[PDB]
Amino acid sequence: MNNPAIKRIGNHITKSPEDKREYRGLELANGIKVLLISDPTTDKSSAALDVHIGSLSDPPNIAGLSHFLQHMLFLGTKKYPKENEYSQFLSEHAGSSNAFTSGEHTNYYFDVSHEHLEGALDRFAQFFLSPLFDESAKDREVNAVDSEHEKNVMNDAWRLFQLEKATGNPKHPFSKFGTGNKYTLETRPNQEGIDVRQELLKFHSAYYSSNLMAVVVLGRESLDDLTNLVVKLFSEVENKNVPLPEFPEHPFQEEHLKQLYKIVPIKDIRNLYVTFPIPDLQKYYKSNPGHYLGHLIGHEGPGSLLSELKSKGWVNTLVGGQKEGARGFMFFIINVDLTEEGLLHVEDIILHMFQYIQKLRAEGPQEWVFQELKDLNAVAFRFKDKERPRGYTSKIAGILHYYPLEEVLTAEYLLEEFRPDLIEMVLDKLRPENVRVAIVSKSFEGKTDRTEEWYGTQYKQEAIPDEVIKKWQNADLNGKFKLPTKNEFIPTNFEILPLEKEATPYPALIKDTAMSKLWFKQDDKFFLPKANLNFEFFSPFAYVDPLHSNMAYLYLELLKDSLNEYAYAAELAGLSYDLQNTIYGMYLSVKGYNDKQPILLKKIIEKMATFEIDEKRFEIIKEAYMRSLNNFRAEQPHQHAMYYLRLLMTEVAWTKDELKEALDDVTLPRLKAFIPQLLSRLHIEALLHGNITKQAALGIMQMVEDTLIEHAHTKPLLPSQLVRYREVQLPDRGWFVYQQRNEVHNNSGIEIYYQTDMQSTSENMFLELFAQIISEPAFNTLRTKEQLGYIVFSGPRRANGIQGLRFIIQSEKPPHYLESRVEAFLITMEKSIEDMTEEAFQKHIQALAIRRLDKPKKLSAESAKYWGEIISQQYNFDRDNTEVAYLKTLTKEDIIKFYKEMLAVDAPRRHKVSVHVLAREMNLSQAPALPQPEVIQNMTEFKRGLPLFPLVKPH
Ligand SMILES: COC(=O)[C@H](Cc1cnc[nH]1)NC(=O)CN(CCCc1ccccc1)CC(=O)O
Ligand SMILES: [Zn+2]
């Protein structure tokens, strides 16, 4: 009978009957709520802690302190004081880890090889026991946070996110600045005599209290074993009985309602944000009146708000529903993007909104809708895919805070109560008398008179004219607006087909004709009534030239726009498709309950092959596409770096500027012509994978072919015109640099590529092992020590059959300098591989092996792996055992000599390309001295003047 350390252990966690995992919920004596998960099949174990404090509890005079504290627990505790003990332990044991801070939560998660849960968890527990907050770490780390913020400065979501806070009640914690930067966490604290290390110590001690913590742990250990484990490591987290913060008063009071904000964006975008304050609905989780109204106002089917708004050519996409706030307040929003016509009809757009809200009011609550929503969720739950442990633990850790233990798994899914009163009550708040309207549009350049402090956002504020409100308050009924009708796409066949006699472990090539290559595998693994049906359509006309590339794109976009109304049912019913053009021709994937899949597929291909373009729709989509082309000049420096490198190293690739130019010559006549052309010769390669039989799959494939032949007279592509593109072949010992300026962002970016060779069993493992070995040392050096920026990445680069090592960094320092430090770092690595024990070397092999061998948890994960073998024409489905068997063979001498051949600064076959992206305005290890780079003036000339690699041979 009773353990002193456990307050209780009832009862029985409700899981899906499909869910093979075992679960124990429990509460420690110190008040920590805890879920244990035993899965004796798992390859990685995982754990997570969530503390119910976050940025909303920041001291007013030190903004971002809790985000900063989160950064700091990683950098040393009393029991494991090495600045990077934690993260290195993880790396050498196939783990990874992150954290985040919302306004009420700080959330910490890791995964490790199943065999080392305990070692991981023990280091992990110390974050919550005796963090060091080293003076020297704090000094460095504040920069990583300053970077985390700069990254966000010029991004439109983050600016709008803060603007909202800065326009509500300034006295309210909602208005606080979450991220924090260097100014708020080092400069102004010094100016005001604060010792931040103390302030972190004070804050950790004040709020990281056990009564405010929830833990989840997933491992192969029995439930009893996990219990002992958790109790051991966590019983000594101290209970300081902290009252859990509430915010009963809304940040939007009367003076904050009936306001119009006109806002200048960074990207050339136009949207309208409509938003009403609502009470906190969390406690209504079993009826969920917010979701009901969301499902409705947000509907995109026939008769919906969105589809009238879009027929009138005013908006294109809509999102509506309940938005989080914190304990005590929430929002209900309706946000749309805007056409040019739309921008001019904002007053009208909102009337339409209120006419629809009025309709809902007119019909009253609807139990049949509730019933649909509830059934949909029952089914979602019953067959939810197995989640990756890290996500799972992190997520549940969050919600242990809201639901009884027994309910944690089901609470966010199952609906129980039908609540016409709550439905009605929330609806009563969606009124013009407490509306907020915000317009984001470049047309406010200069017309602005305010500036948001933290992001610099410029905008104007205004009371909506008393007599615009009145006009909205009288919103009539409007007969273009109907409730949605029954969802016909809801599945009702869930039968798992039995496993065939000749069924196989990997996909089989079951059809090899000139028209198509069908790869097929019945699911032997997850047994859910779902499937994935993937297709590459090859046509050389998709990417023959910039003009065509645009056409391929627009066609597909107008097609998706056209099916949208009908497709949406299917999406709600757990059946979705994804359709986009590639450099190779087109891609189509259909995932979800297999029951009604063949209906949706058929509808897609048919529409595709008999497509009839609305002209108004074309003109709007095109104008939007133009903007998204420009809008690249506002993506981030490192994305630019990455993007130029892709352009520089692929045989064929059209630039954003080329596409922009060629976009003007795209006319209705021209597109109409293009489509039948595209569809007239194709090849199809497909993976059909899931709850389906060989006969079913063969049929599905042929139905696709048949529909095309029938409506597009499609016929086969010639084997020889199955063009796959090559990577540029860099000379032995060369170094080229390409330079560009980012105009928006005041940071710089850099990608450095050391190209090694073709992919091959041996060549792959040489690069992979080296990547694993440097993986954390790189992060720990270039970011944690050197603090070059927030974004510091290294790893293998694999494109068009060739490979290499890359570094990507976004910094404040110039690329000339970034370059220098990577090279410095690179020598440190030859050194430390020389110095490391055979056993340290073997651990790395074992860590790679484990990452490589980790088994898929869900159908779409397994599909992805195969689809990679297929899209890359390597067709090596057994690559993981092969490549791993070979890895174990490798010795230290092999890696030293691999590095010396291909990577060292004076490597006989070093092949280096750097992309330098300059910012809007432009004691340490020893950097080696570098050659004069060759500066690339012209991308085409560069490509013309080098060899191209071969392409890989298949299995
Ligand atoms: C259940 O209700 C729905 O289906 C709607 C409506 C909709 C989706 N697509 C067409 N309409 N879908 C929603 O996602 C509504 N809403 C999203 C607001 C969160 C948010 C967060 C950050 C920045 C902006 C906004 C809640 C949700 O996730 O379900
Ligand atoms: Zn952070």
Tab-separated table of N, CA and C in Angstrom, residues 271-352:
chain	number	residue	atom	x	y	z
A	271	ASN	N	-4.282	41.673	-46.440
A	271	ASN	CA	-5.398	41.015	-45.781
A	271	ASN	C	-6.153	41.905	-44.824
A	272	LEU	N	-7.347	41.417	-44.490
A	272	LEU	CA	-8.221	41.962	-43.459
A	272	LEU	C	-8.302	41.031	-42.257
A	273	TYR	N	-8.060	41.575	-41.061
A	273	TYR	CA	-8.219	40.803	-39.817
A	273	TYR	C	-9.377	41.336	-39.053
A	274	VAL	N	-10.407	40.505	-38.915
A	274	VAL	CA	-11.561	40.808	-38.075
A	274	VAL	C	-11.533	39.906	-36.851
A	275	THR	N	-11.771	40.505	-35.706
A	275	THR	CA	-11.495	39.846	-34.452
A	275	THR	C	-12.399	40.432	-33.348
A	276	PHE	N	-13.107	39.553	-32.631
A	276	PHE	CA	-13.974	39.945	-31.515
A	276	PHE	C	-13.466	39.321	-30.209
A	277	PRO	N	-13.444	40.079	-29.094
A	277	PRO	CA	-13.046	39.477	-27.831
A	277	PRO	C	-14.128	38.546	-27.382
A	278	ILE	N	-13.744	37.414	-26.813
A	278	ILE	CA	-14.703	36.431	-26.315
A	278	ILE	C	-14.204	35.976	-24.961
A	279	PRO	N	-15.097	35.421	-24.135
A	279	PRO	CA	-14.614	34.830	-22.875
A	279	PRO	C	-13.774	33.548	-23.115
A	280	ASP	N	-13.118	33.053	-22.066
A	280	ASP	CA	-12.388	31.801	-22.131
A	280	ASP	C	-13.360	30.596	-22.233
A	281	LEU	N	-13.216	29.830	-23.315
A	281	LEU	CA	-14.061	28.672	-23.606
A	281	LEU	C	-13.418	27.322	-23.243
A	282	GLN	N	-12.175	27.326	-22.776
A	282	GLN	CA	-11.457	26.092	-22.495
A	282	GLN	C	-12.274	25.116	-21.672
A	283	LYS	N	-12.910	25.627	-20.618
A	283	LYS	CA	-13.636	24.756	-19.706
A	283	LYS	C	-14.798	24.080	-20.389
A	284	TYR	N	-15.296	24.652	-21.485
A	284	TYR	CA	-16.321	23.999	-22.291
A	284	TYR	C	-15.760	22.975	-23.245
A	285	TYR	N	-14.708	22.264	-22.872
A	285	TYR	CA	-14.083	21.402	-23.840
A	285	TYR	C	-14.958	20.242	-24.322
A	286	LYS	N	-15.962	19.846	-23.552
A	286	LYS	CA	-16.757	18.687	-23.947
A	286	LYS	C	-17.833	19.046	-24.925
A	287	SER	N	-18.106	20.341	-25.079
A	287	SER	CA	-19.141	20.787	-26.047
A	287	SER	C	-18.574	21.649	-27.145
A	288	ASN	N	-17.674	22.527	-26.737
A	288	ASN	CA	-16.782	23.154	-27.652
A	288	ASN	C	-17.447	24.060	-28.675
A	289	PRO	N	-18.287	24.961	-28.180
A	289	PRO	CA	-19.064	25.943	-28.915
A	289	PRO	C	-18.222	26.802	-29.797
A	290	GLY	N	-17.012	27.144	-29.380
A	290	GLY	CA	-16.107	27.785	-30.328
A	290	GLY	C	-15.820	27.039	-31.647
A	291	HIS	N	-15.787	25.709	-31.598
A	291	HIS	CA	-15.298	24.869	-32.673
A	291	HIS	C	-16.461	24.789	-33.612
A	292	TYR	N	-17.657	24.681	-33.050
A	292	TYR	CA	-18.910	24.598	-33.824
A	292	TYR	C	-19.013	25.837	-34.709
A	293	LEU	N	-18.852	27.012	-34.103
A	293	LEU	CA	-18.971	28.227	-34.872
A	293	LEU	C	-17.800	28.375	-35.809
A	294	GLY	N	-16.646	27.834	-35.447
A	294	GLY	CA	-15.499	27.861	-36.319
A	294	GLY	C	-15.758	27.024	-37.536
A	295	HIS	N	-16.286	25.826	-37.316
A	295	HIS	CA	-16.553	24.869	-38.386
A	295	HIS	C	-17.459	25.462	-39.398
A	296	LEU	N	-18.276	26.395	-38.944
A	296	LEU	CA	-19.319	26.988	-39.762
A	296	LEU	C	-18.847	28.257	-40.524
A	297	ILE	N	-18.461	29.277	-39.756
A	297	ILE	CA	-18.036	30.527	-40.315
A	297	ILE	C	-16.833	30.286	-41.243
A	298	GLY	N	-15.954	29.380	-40.792
A	298	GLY	CA	-14.836	28.901	-41.611
A	298	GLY	C	-15.131	27.929	-42.764
A	299	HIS	N	-16.318	27.329	-42.807
A	299	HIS	CA	-16.645	26.432	-43.917
A	299	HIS	C	-16.303	27.061	-45.286
A	300	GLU	N	-15.880	26.184	-46.193
A	300	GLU	CA	-15.555	26.539	-47.559
A	300	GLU	C	-16.409	25.811	-48.625
A	301	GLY	N	-17.464	25.110	-48.218
A	301	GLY	CA	-18.306	24.406	-49.185
A	301	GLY	C	-19.374	25.312	-49.800
A	302	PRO	N	-20.282	24.728	-50.631
A	302	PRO	CA	-21.378	25.452	-51.243
A	302	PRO	C	-22.142	26.212	-50.165
A	303	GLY	N	-22.482	27.464	-50.434
A	303	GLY	CA	-23.314	28.207	-49.516
A	303	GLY	C	-22.568	28.905	-48.403
A	304	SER	N	-21.240	28.781	-48.373
A	304	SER	CA	-20.442	29.305	-47.251
A	304	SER	C	-20.087	30.765	-47.413
A	305	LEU	N	-19.906	31.448	-46.284
A	305	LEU	CA	-19.301	32.800	-46.269
A	305	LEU	C	-18.196	32.944	-47.308
A	306	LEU	N	-17.171	32.090	-47.227
A	306	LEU	CA	-16.028	32.168	-48.128
A	306	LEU	C	-16.478	32.140	-49.569
A	307	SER	N	-17.384	31.242	-49.956
A	307	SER	CA	-17.653	31.159	-51.410
A	307	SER	C	-18.470	32.273	-52.031
A	308	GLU	N	-19.306	32.956	-51.248
A	308	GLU	CA	-19.837	34.216	-51.742
A	308	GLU	C	-18.730	35.266	-51.811
A	309	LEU	N	-17.858	35.323	-50.813
A	309	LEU	CA	-16.840	36.371	-50.811
A	309	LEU	C	-15.876	36.222	-51.966
A	310	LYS	N	-15.838	35.039	-52.545
A	310	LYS	CA	-14.843	34.733	-53.522
A	310	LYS	C	-15.459	34.798	-54.923
A	311	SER	N	-16.778	34.553	-55.022
A	311	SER	CA	-17.570	34.746	-56.271
A	311	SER	C	-17.636	36.213	-56.632
A	312	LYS	N	-17.687	37.047	-55.611
A	312	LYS	CA	-17.761	38.453	-55.771
A	312	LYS	C	-16.323	38.928	-56.048
A	313	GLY	N	-15.390	37.982	-56.204
A	313	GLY	CA	-13.980	38.266	-56.492
A	313	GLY	C	-13.311	39.191	-55.489
A	314	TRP	N	-13.539	38.963	-54.202
A	314	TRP	CA	-13.087	39.887	-53.177
A	314	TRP	C	-12.044	39.293	-52.245
A	315	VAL	N	-12.238	38.049	-51.828
A	315	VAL	CA	-11.231	37.339	-51.069
A	315	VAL	C	-10.838	36.085	-51.811
A	316	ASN	N	-9.814	35.401	-51.314
A	316	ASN	CA	-9.402	34.121	-51.903
A	316	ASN	C	-9.404	32.934	-50.987
A	317	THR	N	-9.116	33.209	-49.721
A	317	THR	CA	-8.937	32.183	-48.695
A	317	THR	C	-9.478	32.809	-47.423
A	318	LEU	N	-10.015	31.986	-46.523
A	318	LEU	CA	-10.569	32.513	-45.273
A	318	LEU	C	-10.217	31.613	-44.090
A	319	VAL	N	-9.881	32.190	-42.960
A	319	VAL	CA	-9.832	31.373	-41.770
A	319	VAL	C	-10.681	32.077	-40.687
A	320	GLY	N	-11.500	31.275	-40.001
A	320	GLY	CA	-12.322	31.763	-38.883
A	320	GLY	C	-12.440	30.726	-37.782
A	321	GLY	N	-12.671	31.171	-36.565
A	321	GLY	CA	-12.776	30.248	-35.468
A	321	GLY	C	-12.243	30.885	-34.226
A	322	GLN	N	-11.998	30.028	-33.242
A	322	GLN	CA	-11.598	30.490	-31.920
A	322	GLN	C	-10.104	30.457	-31.860
A	323	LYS	N	-9.520	31.530	-31.348
A	323	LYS	CA	-8.083	31.732	-31.222
A	323	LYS	C	-7.758	31.708	-29.724
A	324	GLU	N	-6.607	31.175	-29.329
A	324	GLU	CA	-6.242	31.180	-27.910
A	324	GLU	C	-5.897	32.558	-27.390
A	325	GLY	N	-6.014	32.735	-26.076
A	325	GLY	CA	-5.570	33.960	-25.409
A	325	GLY	C	-4.685	33.527	-24.263
A	326	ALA	N	-5.257	33.463	-23.066
A	326	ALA	CA	-4.641	32.833	-21.904
A	326	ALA	C	-5.810	32.512	-20.990
A	327	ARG	N	-5.567	31.894	-19.826
A	327	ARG	CA	-6.658	31.646	-18.841
A	327	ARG	C	-7.422	32.904	-18.535
A	328	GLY	N	-8.645	33.001	-19.036
A	328	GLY	CA	-9.452	34.176	-18.772
A	328	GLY	C	-9.904	34.961	-19.986
A	329	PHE	N	-9.174	34.861	-21.107
A	329	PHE	CA	-9.592	35.499	-22.359
A	329	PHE	C	-9.241	34.734	-23.653
A	330	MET	N	-10.075	34.929	-24.673
A	330	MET	CA	-9.959	34.260	-25.966
A	330	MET	C	-10.406	35.206	-27.055
A	331	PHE	N	-10.322	34.795	-28.302
A	331	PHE	CA	-10.736	35.658	-29.363
A	331	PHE	C	-11.475	34.803	-30.297
A	332	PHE	N	-12.297	35.449	-31.099
A	332	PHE	CA	-12.913	34.799	-32.210
A	332	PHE	C	-12.563	35.659	-33.379
A	333	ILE	N	-12.125	35.039	-34.450
A	333	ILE	CA	-11.589	35.828	-35.542
A	333	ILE	C	-12.193	35.393	-36.888
A	334	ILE	N	-12.135	36.294	-37.875
A	334	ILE	CA	-12.432	35.938	-39.238
A	334	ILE	C	-11.462	36.743	-40.049
A	335	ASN	N	-10.558	36.057	-40.746
A	335	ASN	CA	-9.484	36.710	-41.476
A	335	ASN	C	-9.512	36.209	-42.869
A	336	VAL	N	-9.316	37.119	-43.819
A	336	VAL	CA	-9.385	36.809	-45.239
A	336	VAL	C	-8.246	37.527	-45.848
A	337	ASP	N	-7.754	37.044	-46.979
A	337	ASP	CA	-6.820	37.849	-47.776
A	337	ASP	C	-7.720	38.676	-48.725
A	338	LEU	N	-7.172	39.541	-49.580
A	338	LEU	CA	-8.017	40.480	-50.324
A	338	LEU	C	-7.528	40.609	-51.738
A	339	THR	N	-8.428	40.591	-52.698
A	339	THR	CA	-8.030	40.929	-54.028
A	339	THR	C	-7.912	42.454	-54.081
A	340	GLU	N	-7.418	42.978	-55.197
A	340	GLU	CA	-7.463	44.410	-55.441
A	340	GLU	C	-8.896	44.962	-55.321
A	341	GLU	N	-9.863	44.259	-55.908
A	341	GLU	CA	-11.238	44.670	-55.775
A	341	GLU	C	-11.571	44.599	-54.294
A	342	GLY	N	-11.170	43.506	-53.656
A	342	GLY	CA	-11.438	43.305	-52.232
A	342	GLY	C	-10.988	44.432	-51.335
A	343	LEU	N	-9.812	44.972	-51.597
A	343	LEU	CA	-9.238	45.995	-50.728
A	343	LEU	C	-10.204	47.168	-50.697
A	344	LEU	N	-10.882	47.357	-51.828
A	344	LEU	CA	-11.740	48.506	-51.983
A	344	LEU	C	-13.109	48.234	-51.419
A	345	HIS	N	-13.388	46.982	-51.074
A	345	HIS	CA	-14.701	46.643	-50.567
A	345	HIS	C	-14.700	46.034	-49.181
A	346	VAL	N	-13.785	46.504	-48.339
A	346	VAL	CA	-13.697	46.008	-46.993
A	346	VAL	C	-14.970	46.227	-46.196
A	347	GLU	N	-15.595	47.401	-46.335
A	347	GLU	CA	-16.821	47.651	-45.599
A	347	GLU	C	-17.883	46.595	-45.938
A	348	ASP	N	-17.979	46.307	-47.226
A	348	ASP	CA	-18.915	45.322	-47.739
A	348	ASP	C	-18.587	43.901	-47.305
A	349	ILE	N	-17.292	43.563	-47.314
A	349	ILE	CA	-16.846	42.243	-46.894
A	349	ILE	C	-17.343	41.954	-45.467
A	350	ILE	N	-17.131	42.899	-44.546
A	350	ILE	CA	-17.609	42.749	-43.180
A	350	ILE	C	-19.140	42.641	-43.062
A	351	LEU	N	-19.882	43.375	-43.903
A	351	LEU	CA	-21.345	43.278	-43.862
A	351	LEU	C	-21.699	41.839	-44.136
A	352	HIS	N	-21.085	41.290	-45.180
A	352	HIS	CA	-21.320	39.896	-45.546
A	352	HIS	C	-21.064	38.917	-44.391
